[PDB]
C-alpha cells in the first residue's frame, strides 16, 4: 500500500544548563529506525530497527555529520526566534521540525512535507507545491523572506522528490518482511457490571500494525460517537498497537450493541458482540 518516511527533530533550549539539546528520530510508517541525540556520550546516528543495521560505516558517518550540522543550525534558529518574539534570554523554548515523503504502492511521490513549530505552535511550512511557504505570523514572515531570498525551497523539493523517495524505496525493500506486513487486530469484548442496572462493554483490539484502526460501537446499528469512551491508540512495545472502545449499557440490552473493527490486516471488517 502507501508508505511514508518522516524525520522528527526536537531542539530545546535550557538557559543555565548548557546548549540546546538536539534529538532526531526517523520513521518508516509507524516503525522507528534511527535516532540521534546531542546529549549521548558520543553523538552518532544509531540503528533502531533490524533492517537498517546492514547499512555500511559510510551511512552512519555521513548521517552523523548531517545531524551535527543541523544541531548547530537549530541553535542559531533558536537565537533568531527568541529575537523575533522579543523574548528574554532566561526562558526555555522548543523548535520542532517534521519532514518527509509519502509514496504509493508503485514507489511514486504522492506528497512531500517540510514544516516547523515553535513552542508547540505551527511556525512555517513548505506548501504542497514544494515551492512556496506559509508563515503563521509576522516572526515566521521573517524566516519566509530569508528562505525566499536564499531559494531555500528548491533544496527542500530536491530532497523530497529525490533522496527521500529513493531511500524510502530502499528501506521498504530491505525491511519488506515487516514494513509490508499488516498484522490484524486480535479482538474480544469484555463485560463489567457497574451497578444492578448498567454494565460496561469494552471492545479490545490488540497486536495490530500499522497503528491506523477504526473501532466503533453501534446500538441498533447506529454509531454511538458521543457515548463511547475511546482511548488513544497505544504502542505495546513489540512494534504492535492496542486500542479499546467502551460503552455503558442498560442491563439486559447487551445484544443490541455491536463493535465494528476496520484495519488493513483484516480480510473483511469485524462485527463483534459480547459472548456470555
Amino acid at each position: 500500500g502507501s508508505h511514508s518516511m518522516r524525520y522528527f527533530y526536537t531542539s530545546v533550549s535550557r538557559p543555565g544548563r548548557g546548549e540546546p539539546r538536539f534529538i532526531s528520530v526517523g520513521y518508516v510508517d509507524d516503525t522507528q529506525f534511527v535516532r540521534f541525540d546531542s546529549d549521548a556520550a558520543s553523538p552518532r546516528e544509531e540503528p533502531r530497527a533490524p533492517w537498517i543495521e546492514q547499512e555500511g560505516p559510510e551511512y552512519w558517518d555521513r548521517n552523523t555529520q548531517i545531524y551535527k550540522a543541523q544541531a548547530q543550525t537549530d541553535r542559531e534558529s533558536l537565537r533568531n526566534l527568541r529575537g523575533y518574539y522579543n523574548q528574554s534570554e532566561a526562558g526555555s523554548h522548543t523548535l520542532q521540525s517534521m519532514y518527509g515523503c509519502d509514496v504509493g504502492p508503485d514507489g511514486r511521490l504522492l506528497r512531500g512535507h517540510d514544516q516547523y513549530a515553535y513552542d508547540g505552535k505551527d511556525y512555517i511550512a513548505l506548501n504542497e507545491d514544494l515551492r512556496s511557504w506559509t508563515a503563521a505570523d509576522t516572526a515566521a514572515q521573517i524566516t519566509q523572506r530569508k528562505w525566499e531570498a536564499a531559494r531555500e525551497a528548491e533544496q527542500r523539493r530536491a530532497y523530497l522528490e529525490g533522496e527521500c523517495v529513493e531511500w524510502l524505496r530502499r528501506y521498504l525493500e530491505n525491511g519488506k518482511d515487516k514494513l509490508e506486513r499488516a498484522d490484524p487486530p486480535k479482538t474480544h469484548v469484555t463485560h463489567h457490571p457497574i451497578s444492578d442496572h448498567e454494565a460496561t462493554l469494552r471492545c479490545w483490539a490488540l497486536g495490530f500494525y500499522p497503528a491506523e484502526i477504526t473501532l466503533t460501537w453501534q446500538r441498533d446499528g447506529e454509531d454511538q460517537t458521543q457515548d463511547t469512551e475511546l482511548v488513544e491508540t497505544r504502542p505495546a512495545g513489540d512494534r504492535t498497537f492496542q486500542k479499546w472502545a467502551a460503552v455503558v449499557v442498560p442491563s439486559g440490552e447487551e445484544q443490541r450493541y455491536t463493535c465494528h473493527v476496520q484495519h488493513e490486516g483484516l480480510p473483511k471488517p469485524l462485527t463483534l458482540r459480547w459472548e456470555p
Binding site: Y67, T143, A150
Partner: peptide
C-alpha cells in the same frame, strides 16, 4: 536518510 538544508538558519 536525513535532509541537508541551506544552513542559513531561520
Amino acid at each position: 536518510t536525513p535532509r541537508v538544508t541551506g544552513g542559513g538558519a531561520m
